[model samples]
Target: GAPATVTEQGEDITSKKDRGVLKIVKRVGNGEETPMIGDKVYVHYKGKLSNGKKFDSSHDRNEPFVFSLGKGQVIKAWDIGVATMKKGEICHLLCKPEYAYGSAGSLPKIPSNATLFFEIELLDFKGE
Candidate 1:
């Protein structure tokens, strides 16, 4: 895979102080039903860089993000936030370092301890 396009919105000291990484804006998708760990969900999404670069896209790939919530397949922040979401809803995820790639940074674009932002949409749900 490639590096995601980064998007900057609003950040706080909690992010910089804790992870040394900048925080983007955070937005939730559903307030109705929050999915927990081990829940399988289907979603269409676009993963980008802070510079507004598009890297991964379920929509473009014509696939869905089918994964279990809080299963470590994704970043920690994603698991935590997505757990509070439902189907057909969209969310803006801002992940800190510990909740993201951490000290070990991804080469090419993602720096060490860099924060990540995601625009996610919940498409389907299964499991608990």
Candidate 2:
């Protein structure tokens, strides 16, 4: 675990690849897109393999990804990362396998050492 909040903001988290590990590259844009710890948010996203193969995309499906932030509704990484973003904001995330399915990977689309990319938009949050 990170020692005493030493992890600086916007640092590409280099912690050992373990479940729930997060590596936020950059925090861009501005708005009410930032979500509270317990807020439920609506988002649209595209997830792909590092090699540029699309594995999941709400935009492609003409759908949206919605869930409660920090509520364990999704993977531990998404739940943690999205809370730091604001409404109308977009974040590009590169998740380590520790944040993913790890050694098993996620089937044919995701292979070993395959970093995941998430192009996400924070739409709205519940209770606000």
Candidate 3:
């Protein structure tokens, strides 16, 4: 467990692969099967730099983002964090460059070596 303040924000569900690079704070959790590799997941996310600089948001698009679970279709953080998330769960993922865009970072939006905070809501998932 982290500090009380950190726990209040969310629990640290950081996996070993991500280690110090990623921290997942689960704000909400539900009793349901988690996603597996190849499952299609529906989620909404708000992304910001550690400085709180808004970079991108699926919320702005008013659509639930869909992606293949554990397929390397998303960042390392999402792959690890979302895999453990239950349906209807919401989590805040704190990511270092190692688990995000790496040292080079993503261009035109994410800056180099910037830490990132993502509020991700898992709406649902299915296999097809």
Write the residue-wise lDDT of candidate 1 on 21-78 in tens digits: 3333234444577676688978777766656577678898888878888788877766
After aligning candidate 2 to the native by TM-score, how far in Å is the CA of 43 from where it should be?
0.5
Clashes in model 3: which pairs? none
Best TM-score among the predictions, by candidate number: 3
Q: Candidate 3, TM-score vs. the true structure?
A: 0.83
Residue ranges of candidate 1 with Cα displaced over 4 Å: 1-31
Selected candidate, larger lDDT, 1 vs 3:
3
Where model 3 places Cα greater than 4 Å from the true spot, the runs are 1-14, 21-26
Native RMSD of candidate 2 (Å): 6.7
Residue 93 lDDT (model 3): 72
Clash pairs for candidate 2: 32-87, 33-85, 33-86, 33-87, 34-85, 34-86
TM-score of each: 0.71, 0.71, 0.83
Clashes of each: 9, 6, 0
Over 4 Å off, model 2: 1-10, 13-33
Q: lDDT tens string, model 2, 15-90? A: 3444233434334556444677777688888787756567888988787877767777876568766776776777
- Candidates ranked, most accurate by lDDT first: 3, 2, 1
How do all the candidates rank in terms of TM-score, highest first? 3, 2, 1
